[PDB]
Design a protein around this ligand. Structure first.
Ligand SMILES: C=C[C@]1(C)C[C@@H](OC(=O)CSCCN(CC)CC)[C@]2(C)[C@H](C)CC[C@]3(CCC(=O)[C@H]32)[C@@H](C)[C@@H]1O
Ligand SMILES: [Cl-]
Ligand SMILES: [Cl-]
Ligand SMILES: [Cl-]
Ligand SMILES: [Cl-]
Ligand SMILES: [Cl-]
Ligand SMILES: [Cl-]
Ligand SMILES: [Cl-]
Ligand SMILES: [Mg+2]
Ligand SMILES: [Mg+2]
Ligand SMILES: [Mg+2]
Ligand SMILES: [Mg+2]
Ligand SMILES: [Mg+2]
Ligand SMILES: [Mg+2]
Ligand SMILES: [Mg+2]
Ligand SMILES: [Mg+2]
Ligand SMILES: [Mg+2]
Ligand SMILES: [Mg+2]
Ligand SMILES: [Mg+2]
Ligand SMILES: [Mg+2]
Ligand SMILES: [Mg+2]
Ligand SMILES: [Mg+2]
Ligand SMILES: [Mg+2]
Ligand SMILES: [Mg+2]
Ligand SMILES: [Mg+2]
Ligand SMILES: [Mg+2]
Ligand SMILES: [Mg+2]
Ligand code: NA
Ligand code: NA
Ligand code: NA
Ligand code: NA
Ligand code: NA
Ligand code: NA
Ligand code: NA
Ligand code: NA
Ligand code: NA
Ligand code: NA
Ligand code: NA
Ligand code: NA
Ligand code: NA
Ligand code: NA
Ligand code: NA
Ligand code: NA
Ligand code: NA
Ligand code: NA
Ligand code: NA
Ligand SMILES: [Sr+2]
Ligand SMILES: [Sr+2]
Ligand SMILES: [Sr+2]
Ligand SMILES: [Sr+2]
Ligand SMILES: [Sr+2]
Ligand SMILES: [Sr+2]
Ligand SMILES: [Sr+2]
Ligand SMILES: [Sr+2]
Ligand SMILES: [Sr+2]
Ligand SMILES: [Sr+2]
Ligand SMILES: [Sr+2]
Ligand SMILES: [Sr+2]
Ligand SMILES: [Sr+2]
Ligand SMILES: [Sr+2]
Ligand SMILES: [Sr+2]
Ligand SMILES: [Sr+2]
Ligand SMILES: [Sr+2]
Ligand SMILES: [Sr+2]
Ligand SMILES: [Sr+2]
Ligand SMILES: [Sr+2]
Ligand SMILES: [Sr+2]
Ligand SMILES: [Sr+2]
Lengths: 142, 160, 132, 337, 172
RNA sequence: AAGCCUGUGUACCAGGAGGGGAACAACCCAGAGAUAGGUUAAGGUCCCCAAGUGUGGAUUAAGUGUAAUCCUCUGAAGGUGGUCUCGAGCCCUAGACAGCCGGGAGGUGAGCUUAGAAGCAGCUACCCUCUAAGAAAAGCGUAACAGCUUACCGGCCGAGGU
RNA sequence: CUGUCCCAACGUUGGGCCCGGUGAACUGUACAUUCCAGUGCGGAGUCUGGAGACACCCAGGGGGAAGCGAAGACCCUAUGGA
RNA sequence: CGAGUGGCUUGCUACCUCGAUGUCGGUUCCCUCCAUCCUGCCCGUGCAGAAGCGGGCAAGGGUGAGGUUGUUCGCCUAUUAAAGGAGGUCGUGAGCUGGGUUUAGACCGUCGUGAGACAGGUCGGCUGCUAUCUACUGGGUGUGUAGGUGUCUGACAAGA
RNA sequence: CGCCACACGGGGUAAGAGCUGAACGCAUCUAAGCUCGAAACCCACUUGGAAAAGAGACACCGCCGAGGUCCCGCGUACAAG
């Protein structure tokens, strides 16, 4: 409920890591970024291998723990954390001022940053984050 | 013993039999195969087996790759076919094996090997035009019993 | 196997000395194995009433002794449970020797039998004296 | 070569800690089939007695014969469905929306709750119908409560409140079915939801055993032989290997046993009746005299005599329903013999 | 490259995104044709499959899309026909069509019926010992025809002795 | 074989900071008084992280790879109609390659061997008519015939093919 | 012959746990909420990378601190002793 | 004949520890590996069926009880669906046992002039410590989230 | 040592059986596409779970009084708590 965002980004057909990297850069500049339509995000490569990597991360853990998100909600939020020094003062404040959403809780449409978008007519080998999440063990709530 | 121990050239030239004693004899029987009465110039084709990597092939690996290689030419062209195969290399490099501990490390004599440089012809066959695809197959079996990857080169033969 | 129509509490173990309720020349029988049973780590293989068990003759006639023959547990000391809730227990623990086709090695069987052994091993029942 | 053996105790009912609510809380509810109704009842455990029956199973050669079956006596007095709750389909799951409450409350319901004096049921009901029109309405559940004051053998008068799902028909016709029970007073007996001979699921918080050791807790071996006299009797071999240089949470250790919530599956209801037919001579041990609405549950039931148990139509049954069994004899003999 | 396909008089094909729907007197077949840099279009009455790239991998699909369109045309004109004949040796096998699924009973003496399912629109009709699978979508027909033969798969024993089951007789 | 033993030349560590290499005596830059401003080196410029989501072009579909050197970063013999670029001989609008159709004939079942063998068990030959083709039969098949094709000719088709 | 075992159960007494009083010691380079990998003199809570991690306290059984305790008795060495 | 993976055996090296990192075998208790003994689904057959043989996928679960021997290993019996193999300081002695190796006592055989010796045998022959830190099993008290009660949700977590 | 309860079915695959299908006019299970297929994977089910720092939602009650604590009598609880 309510988040005063400076920049609002649309993840629709946008290469995950590349978006995350620009969102991370901007978080450190002092911007309140909000990634929208995470379910409709994308990751390039063979579906079978992208799934194996993500399934392994769910199997990984011990008594100490290693919580890895299954929902496409948090998968984007954890990739952003992997580009931010989340264990420093500055890096925590920047990360906490970035929230990822499934769909769009706002009225304003999100922008598509340059270089992030994929051409579906030129590509066939990719996956949707929601397609990864149904394979991980989540409940389709989007 | 695995050829992995003797395939590389790292030991000095140890060939002088007037200093080395108790050397096991060659496992090889024939160096000149086929019809050794006829010349190599009486044949239109000269297809050789070229070694790509600089190795040291043992007399056992030589005998084995000569055997199943010549046995295909005896199988396909008969016991007295119109061919003549040749193994131009000879095993001179005497091998060792330490068999105690590392005290008195100089090993006793176990076998013999031939120093083959890269680009050289180990085997060289001289056949007829129709029997050529049988020899390119006698060499496909011969390179599987030696240590390196090989080239089958036609030195005389624009008949294709 | 075919249901007994009663819940048993396995009253025997492996190495257990039981009686041979027949005329085969076999007096005392010693349990070796329980046909079809697979246990757990650190457990003596338990036998109950109405179990085909592998046995060896302990006491008897010179020709019958030292033989490894199969048998069926006819009687036991530990209470078994009939469907009507009643418990039933016998005087001793006994068994009758049997063959490949599950027919008794003898002709006349000594002492009472249980009505639950009848359903399964009928060829022993149609040779039984008393049935309880 | 170290013989194999399955690990001691289950690793599914973890962690073995004390329960939060003594009142069982379901996490799974039945699928929607036919008629709209409530999906569960609740009562208080009374004790045990045996009952003789006629075998209902057509696959059994005992079909028609007398069979003695053990039965847990549980007093099940009528409950009051005091409210109706709605869930909106948020991307975060099923979050509650609003509740519709009554006017007529129980004289002693203010022993746990802050009883509403001024509530607006009408406009709250409108919000649920607008959410239904929108297409985001999830599952509809009723805030049920018990009447412990109805049971003379239970000292507690402070009502145990719990949520229960309504399902069976279309989302429209069941919202209305729920509202209809609420406007009256919410009075419903076991006859309303359960029929005798059906398979139910009894959920209950087990008997409290305090802190017990590995042998009792995880059923591990006592030290055997010579190893039993050296000063170690009920303590395990080791807490783990050299590396990993940490004790795993999977190793059988000491701790709290009992007072855990369990959901005992496929429990057959043998008879649902009223009066003093299942009561024992001298009364039930540490409970008392049963006279009134009850249920007869086959086998055992989690928890001690006096604790609240919950019923639900079996989510995973194996055998086909064999309604209303021929209950010939119910025992009355004293449990003090 | 570019390949222009002439659509017949009995046929009408419409486009919406990457989806091609072919309508005619035998039915309507909807398909999704997608691959990198290949674009399919309708130039009024001709189907054009064109891509800027000429690599073997692309040429593989341009070719496959042509046969997927050409065969959709035959689907809406004449239709697809697969002929099947039930075979039995000792056991009186019964193959009856029940609802949207073809069922086989008493196969090899089994109490349990072996039932498959009809894929899409496809019509499976029986004339005693014969069976004829027919329809516009070759994808559904060839699969419904296969599903029937494959339903009588026996891996447990020798198929040279146990030859019972429906087989494909006529391939279009 | 060794993060093995033992020489030699040399530089370095030991006794050498600082920079880079994720960490890491000896690998790369670099030899270094204090303070300060500036430009570089090795190395690096999507984020973590200072600097390009830089430019012209091709390849790769395996997450190959994103790993200078290394006990440390593997990967081999063999195999590949995965795919890309290049050259060579030969065939082709006098219609190639493939596919589908048609024809695939008689003297004559070659002869001998043999009770028999008639394209096709074996021995030896391997010959000529009609024609646009058609083997003394190349592969299956039959007790043998028969049957099915294969060489070979014609047609359909239409572009490169091998 | 039997609880040695199958297979563990209940009980008994003194402890153990809470309250008063009394009141030590072993050990302590420093820091120290860890875990998974890696690296390093090749056996790291402390280095690198990640993961995890709100603080304090009670009981516990002892996986780890190559735990504490003892300048290895083994082995070699010393131009050692008996 | 050739090419390799492994790190379970053995061997080599002497980097690590001699101001001590407790042995073997066993036991108890926990996590794991697959190079799969059984169980599931498959391919071939010298696949009629039946019981096999050989191969593929697959580590969820299982793989037990006993006789001799300290034995690991192994031989043996009977059951079984099968009675797989390996890693975790050859898992585990601030858990256990102490039968074997390896003290001081003694005997036999061999050698030795002799003291005495033996990678020959044999009998007897000890197992310390009150847990600071951390680790996990369970149990409380505070703070944060920012007045009280009751009912829930589900990011995640565990299971065979 | 007694007694009670502990799925079926789905979803996606592996090896594998196949369908449509091209590069390669044919053929071809595969290159694009698809139908099936393991005790194995996800779901189902059971247990934990507002400290999830995005530190949650609903209903009511109260902010000068809602509610809690002490206290008292005791257990469905219990080593202190
Ligand atoms: C005696 C040392 C013991 C207790 C045991 C020792 O074993 C030996 O040293 C061989 S002799 C053993 C018997 N010992 C008396 C106990 C003879 C003097 C043994 C197993 C090794 C072989 C040597 C190193 C070690 C510590 C690590 C280890 O495994 C120990 C020493 C330092 C330990 O203190
Ligand atoms: Cl975890
Ligand atoms: Cl950080
Ligand atoms: Cl693509
Ligand atoms: Cl046994
Ligand atoms: Cl023990
Ligand atoms: Cl200098
Ligand atoms: Cl990846
Ligand atoms: Mg044992
Ligand atoms: Mg009683
Ligand atoms: Mg009595
Ligand atoms: Mg068979
Ligand atoms: Mg020095
Ligand atoms: Mg930058
Ligand atoms: Mg790689
Ligand atoms: Mg000494
Ligand atoms: Mg002296
Ligand atoms: Mg010393
Ligand atoms: Mg230690
Ligand atoms: Mg495998
Ligand atoms: Mg496992
Ligand atoms: Mg060990
Ligand atoms: Mg230990
Ligand atoms: Mg000790
Ligand atoms: Mg001994
Ligand atoms: Mg001894
Ligand atoms: Mg101690
Ligand atoms: Na990617
Ligand atoms: Na995880
Ligand atoms: Na020596
Ligand atoms: Na003790
Ligand atoms: Na230890
Ligand atoms: Na120097
Ligand atoms: Na550095
Ligand atoms: Na990679
Ligand atoms: Na006792
Ligand atoms: Na410890
Ligand atoms: Na290796
Ligand atoms: Na080693
Ligand atoms: Na041990
Ligand atoms: Na397994
Ligand atoms: Na043994
Ligand atoms: Na050790
Ligand atoms: Na030990
Ligand atoms: Na000890
Ligand atoms: Na399946
Ligand atoms: Sr940037
Ligand atoms: Sr050398
Ligand atoms: Sr080779
Ligand atoms: Sr072990
Ligand atoms: Sr509930
Ligand atoms: Sr739940
Ligand atoms: Sr002791
Ligand atoms: Sr460690
Ligand atoms: Sr770029
Ligand atoms: Sr290393
Ligand atoms: Sr290669
Ligand atoms: Sr303690
Ligand atoms: Sr594997
Ligand atoms: Sr199998
Ligand atoms: Sr050993
Ligand atoms: Sr042995
Ligand atoms: Sr001893
Ligand atoms: Sr002595
Ligand atoms: Sr000795
Ligand atoms: Sr704070
Ligand atoms: Sr497949
Ligand atoms: Sr909270």
């Amino acid at each position: 409920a309510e988040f005063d965002a400076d920049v609002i980004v649309d993840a629709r057909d946008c290469i995950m890591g590349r978006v995350a990297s620009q969102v991370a850069e901007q978080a450190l500049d002092g911007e309140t970024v909000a990634v929208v339509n995470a379910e409709r995000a994308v990751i390039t490569g063979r579906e079978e291998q992208i799934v194996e990597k993500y399934e392994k991360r769910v199997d990984i853990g011990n008594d100490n723990g290693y919580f890895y998100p299954k929902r496409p909600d948090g998968i984007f939020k954890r990739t952003i954390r992997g580009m931010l020094p989340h264990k420093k003062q500055r890096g925590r404040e920047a990360f906490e001022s970035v929230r990822v959403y499934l769909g769009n809780p706002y009225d304003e449409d999100g922008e598509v940053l340059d270089g992030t978008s994929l051409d579906r007519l030129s590509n066939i080998k990719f996956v949707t984050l929601g397609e990864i999440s149904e394979t991980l063990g989540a409940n389709k709530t989007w | 013993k695995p050829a992995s121990m003797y395939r590389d050239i790292d030991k000095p030239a140890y060939t002088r039999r007037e200093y080395i004693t108790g050397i096991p004899g060659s496992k090889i029987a024939q160096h000149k195969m086929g019809r050794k009465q006829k010349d190599a110039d009486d044949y239109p084709v000269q297809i050789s087996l070229i070694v790509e990597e600089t190795v040291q092939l043992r007399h056992g690996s030589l005998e084995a790759s000569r055997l199943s290689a010549n046995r295909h030419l005896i199988k396909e062209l008969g016991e007295e076919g119109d061919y003549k195969m040749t193994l131009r290399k000879f095993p001179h490099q005497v091998l060792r094996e330490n068999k105690d501990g590392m005290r008195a490390a100089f090993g006793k004599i176990v076998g013999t090997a031939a120093r083959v440089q890269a680009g050289e012809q180990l085997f060289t066959a001289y056949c007829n035009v129709e029997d050529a695809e049988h020899v390119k197959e006698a060499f496909r079996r011969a390179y599987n019993k030696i240590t390196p990857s090989c080239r089958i080169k036609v030195e005389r033969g624009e008949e294709l | 196997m075919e249901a007994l129509g009663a819940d048993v509490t396995q009253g025997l173990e492996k190495g257990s000395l039981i009686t041979c309720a027949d005329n085969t020349g076999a007096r005392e029988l010693k349990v070796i194995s329980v046909h079809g049973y697979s246990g757990t780590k650190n457990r003596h293989p338990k036998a109950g009433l109405g179990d085909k068990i592998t046995v060896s003759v302990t006491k008897g006639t010179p020709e019958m002794r030292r033989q490894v023959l199969e048998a069926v547990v006819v009687r036991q000391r530990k209470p078994i449970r009939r469907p009507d809730g009643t418990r039933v227990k016998f005087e001793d623990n006994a068994a009758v020797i049997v063959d490949e086709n599950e027919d008794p090695r003898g002709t006349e069987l000594k002492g009472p039998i249980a009505r639950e052994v009848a359903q399964r091993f009928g060829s022993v029942a149609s040779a039984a004296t008393m049935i309880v | 070569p170290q013989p194999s053996r399955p690990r001691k105790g289950s690793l599914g009912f973890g962690p073995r800690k004390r329960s939060t609510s003594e009142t069982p809380r379901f996490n799974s509810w039945p699928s929607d089939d036919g008629q709209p109704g409530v999906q569960g009842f609740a009562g208080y455990k009374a004790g045990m007695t045996h009952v003789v029956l006629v075998n209902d199973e057509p696959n059994s050669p005992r079909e028609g014969m007398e069979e003695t079956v053990p039965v847990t006596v549980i007093e099940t007095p009528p409950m009051r469905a005091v409210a109706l709750r709605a869930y909106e389909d948020t991307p975060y799951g099923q979050r509650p929306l609003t509740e519709v409450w009554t006017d007529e409350f129980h004289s002693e319901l203010d022993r746990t709750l802050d009883v509403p004096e001024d509530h607006d049921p009408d406009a709250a009901e409108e919000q649920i119908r607008d959410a239904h029109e929108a297409g985001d309405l999830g599952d509809l559940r009723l805030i049920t409560h018990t009447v412990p004051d109805a049971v003379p053998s239970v000292p507690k008068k402070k009502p145990d409140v719990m949520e229960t799902r309504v399902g069976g028909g279309s989302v429209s016709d069941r919202l209305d079915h729920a509202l209809d029970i609420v406007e009256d007073g919410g009075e419903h007996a076991m006859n309303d939801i359960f029929r005798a001979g059906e398979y139910a699921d009894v959920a209950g918080v087990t008997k409290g055993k305090g802190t017990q050791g590995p042998v009792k807790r995880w059923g591990v071996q006592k030290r055997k032989g010579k190893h039993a006299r050296q000063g170690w009797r009920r303590r395990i071999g080791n807490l783990g290997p050299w590396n990993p240089s940490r004790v795993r949470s999977t190793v059988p250790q000491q701790g709290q046993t009992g007072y855990h919530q369990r959901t005992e599956l496929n429990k057959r209801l043998i008879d649902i009746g009223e009066g003093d037919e299942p009561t024992v001579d001298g009364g039930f041990v540490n409970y008392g005299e049963v006279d009134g609405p009850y249920t007869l549950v086959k086998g055992s039931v989690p928890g001690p005599d006096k604790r609240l148990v919950r019923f639900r139509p079996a989510v995973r049954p194996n055998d086909q329903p064999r309604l209303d069994p021929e209950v010939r004899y119910v025992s009355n003999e004293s449990n003090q013999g | 490259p570019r390949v222009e396909l002439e659509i017949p008089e009995d046929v009408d094909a419409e486009q919406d995104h990457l989806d091609i729907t072919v309508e005619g007197d035998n039915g309507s077949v909807t398909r999704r044709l997608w691959y990198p840099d290949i674009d399919v279009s309708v130039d009024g009455d001709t189907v054009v499959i064109e891509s800027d790239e000429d690599n073997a991998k692309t040429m593989s699909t341009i070719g496959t899309f042509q046969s997927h369109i050409e065969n959709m045309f035959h689907g809406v004109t004449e239709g697809w026909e697969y002929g099947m004949e039930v075979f039995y040796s000792h056991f009186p096998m019964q193959v009856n069509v029940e609802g949207d699924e073809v069922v086989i009973e008493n196969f090899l003496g089994e109490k349990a019926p072996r039932r498959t399912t009809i894929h899409g629109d496809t019509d499976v009709e029986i004339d005693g010992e014969e069976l004829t699978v027919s329809g516009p979508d070759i994808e559904a027909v060839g699969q419904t025809a296969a599903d029937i033969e494959q339903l009588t798969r026996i891996n447990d024993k020798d198929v040279r002795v146990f030859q019972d089951g429906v087989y494909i007789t006529r391939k279009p």
